């Protein structure tokens, strides 16, 4: 019968793979500024969800067409044995784009790689996208306004993203990224027992009670931040220790 | 003892307040004929349905049908601008058709972000820090009917058209079907996602945290299929929703003391 409380099921052989895309800079006729800061944030990702069980894989500065035949490949490799796929994106954005270190791609293509029909063992459980992404321009702290769409995609995806419209994105040039900040210290502390949209939930309380009143830089006072996650989820969602 | 000021994982909105504040329905059955768009039989079942739901969760629900863009903003204004000083959230529904970052009035187009923008931080001070809750059925008007002037129940299919917009910090921004995905309403039950949504809400919504129950939701519409033999053509147009969450704490509806 129907089951209010039903969890997706997460005792298979291996939790499954984290993907890292990670862009600090850009080919010069894009025209974009570097991303200082993303390291930090790259770094502090893998050791998050490694310590969830995830194997992870990074890729910094991918040229579109390297990205796209990496995210394809790992698209087509059987994930039978896995409990759900996690993809990250650390870049700049704009609408349904985020960019590669030679040009941008649309979001909706990278989703569509894990939909049922063109990767059947994924079927039924979470695709997990974290987009760190918005518009481009010692501890500096850089503001970008929201520009990267807070997009849907298929049953049991769910699409976190650092930044809603008409809010900002940002990032310390030595700690990384208020988002990544708030969501890696929660993974930390919380990720192995709290389902995973009330965490997402307390990075929201989180990234938006961070003060901008009185910001070094006076041009970035009330440029406040406020993240979101778009759920297609259908199950309660935990990463207990496997 | 006492909670000191530190950040606690299992935080839940107060929902102590003397009212459990306003819940507003926009019902839109037909259209100006220049819009040239179809009626929408079945949208009063899901006005019925939410209002049933709503009220026993103890909402004060207020229902308008049909106003036209002008009117409609005036009335969302009005609440707008009085005080929610003693509501512990908001509720807003509208039931229509929609086009990107669109829902229709009875003869022109709204802005989603106009409306949401109302309730924004100091626009709305007494809301501040409360669970904003939007809740939208609307997608694309099929349209061939033509531009001129003009009970079994079927079920009509609608392609995915208004955008998952996010809001400010406390808004709930839930949406009938992603894109890429198809809306579904019979004309006499109401729409899927409507009717899977108020029986949630009547099952449990006095105790599951809210998006936990929108997850439900999610897997219920999902999860559903139109008879073959009834509609061939609507194999295939499987409905996702999804919600996009600007909270920042635990939502419940427990029975008010
Ligand atoms: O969400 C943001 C973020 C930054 C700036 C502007 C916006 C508003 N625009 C958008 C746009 C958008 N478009 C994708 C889409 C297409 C068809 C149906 C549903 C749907 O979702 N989805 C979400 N937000």
Redesign the interface.
């Known amino acids: 019968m129907?089951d209010?409380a039903?969890k997706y099921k997460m005792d298979h052989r291996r939790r499954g793979i984290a993907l890292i895309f990670n862009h600090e800079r850009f080919f010069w006729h894009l025209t974009l500024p570097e991303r200082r800061g993303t390291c930090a944030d790259r770094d502090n990702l893998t050791r998050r969800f490694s310590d969830l069980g995830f194997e992870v894989k990074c890729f910094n500065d991918l040229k579109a067409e390297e990205l796209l035949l990496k995210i394809h490949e790992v698209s087509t490799v059987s994930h039978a044995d896995a409990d759900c796929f996690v993809c990250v994106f650390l870049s700049h954005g704009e609408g349904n784009h985020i960019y590669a270190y030679d040009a941008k791609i649309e979001i909706?293509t990278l989703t569509g790689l894990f939909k049922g029909d063109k990767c059947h063992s994924l079927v039924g459980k979470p695709k997990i996208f974290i987009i760190q992404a918005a518009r481009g321009n010692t501890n500096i702290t850089e503001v970008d306004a929201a520009s990267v769409?807070?997009?849907?995609?298929?049953?049991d995806f769910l699409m976190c993203?650092s930044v809603?419209?008409?809010?900002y994105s940002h990032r310390e040039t030595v700690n990384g990224s208020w988002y990544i900040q708030d969501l890696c210290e929660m993974l930390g502390?919380?990720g192995s027992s709290?389902?995973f949209?009330?965490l997402?939930?307390?990075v929201?309380?989180?990234v938006?009670?961070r003060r901008v009143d009185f910001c070094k830089d006076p041009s970035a006072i009330g440029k406040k931040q406020?993240?979101?996650?778009?759920?297609?989820?259908?199950?309660?969602l935990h990463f207990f220790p496997k």
Request: contains cysteine.
């Open positions: 129907f209010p039903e909706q769409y807070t997009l849907p995609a298929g049953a993203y809603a419209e008409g809010y502390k919380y709290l389902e949209t009330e997402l939930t307390l929201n309380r989180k938006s009670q406020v993240p979101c996650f778009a759920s297609m989820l259908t199950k309660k």
